[PDB]
Amino acid sequence: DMEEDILEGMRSQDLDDYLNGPFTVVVKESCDGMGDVSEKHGSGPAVPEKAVRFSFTVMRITIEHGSQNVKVFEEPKPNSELCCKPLCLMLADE
Amino acid sequence: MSLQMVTVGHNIALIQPGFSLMNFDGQVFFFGQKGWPKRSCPTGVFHFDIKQNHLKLKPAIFSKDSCYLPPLRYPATCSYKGKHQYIIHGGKTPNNELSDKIYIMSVACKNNKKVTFRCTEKDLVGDVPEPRYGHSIDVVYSRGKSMGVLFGGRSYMPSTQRTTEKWNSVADCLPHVFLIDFEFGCATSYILPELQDGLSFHVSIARNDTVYILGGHSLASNIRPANLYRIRVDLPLGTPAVNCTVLPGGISVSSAILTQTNNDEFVIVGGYQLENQKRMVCSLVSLGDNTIEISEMETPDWTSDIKHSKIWFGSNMGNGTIFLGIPGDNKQAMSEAFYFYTLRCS
Lengths: 94, 346
Ligand SMILES: [Ca+2]
Hints:
2 chains, B: five-stranded mixed β-sheet, 1 helix, binds calcium ion, metal-binding (chain B), phosphatidylinositol-4,5-bisphosphate binding (chain B), phosphatidylinositol-3,4,5-trisphosphate binding (chain B), chromatin regulator (chain B)
């Protein structure tokens, strides 16, 4: 999905588009048990139900050009609403 | 057969489907709580003291040289009543991983309703059985010696055919019979040609030279073999020997609770008949010298809830007293997570 962005990153870093170095990716892991994700379908406020969403975020991508690691990609807004890729989600108390 | 509702203290949530009730001199001890051991009770064990339909789960310390064992959920619990002590084998660690250690529960010190347990970690050699749950172990005697007969229960796939898309699937262990020497913790597996299909959650009654295996669930085909087995053991001067015999009149049940109502006379209460029919009828098993005899008894009156709920569990307290559990109406006026009952049997 971020192929185009990291290609542009290699361009900007004065590298080869056709370079296949061992790109080391650095991923962030985040699990947070949001609560009270229910809604009243009919009459009765009875049941509160919780949820858990385990997710990750590609935080940086770095190729080892020659003998140095150049930052082909870094997330602009790391802890942002819309780069935390969801991975698993469940209806269960944390 | 006298059902009676019970009320629980504040730490009610600790009781979960799969709990154990060990017993020491009429003093019952809860084991296998929900979640890892808290700091209000560092060990997991509890005085399971019931008085006036009210039980007080009270913390209970261990010894100074014991081993703190995790709260298991479907162990194998056999009363090696020979220095009374219990044997725990296998189960489900709160991380949903199975265990293989053996634990030995004795009582190292007691003073005026204050017991100090002693849990020692016995490890096996030879043909160690597979880390599994739902199985059943029983101590059986022969020619002045004793041994432990462990009959298989289900388990996780091995570390080869265990894919992550089905990481939690389970397979019944192969129907072997494991003889376990406690004096040295030595295992020996025997393949009885009369035992064919895997079996878990069964009922195992030991009478001083044999093991009566009865009921249970067989996941390999999702059925409940109504048969039963009599494993006769004998201990020669050298290698032990075992034989089996099928018999008629076997119950068709899984997850049925056992207790020794009278000397050489057991009762058995409801497990599950079909995946929609919880078992209601109670059956008294008259043991004897050589002949078992299952029969039906006075169909204890179940309350409305117990006839409504679809899953239900418990265990024996030891003196013909079966402690039960009921989930409780989910869509209700904040019904509790579990209600509890007790059934005496005299
Ligand atoms: Ca949180």
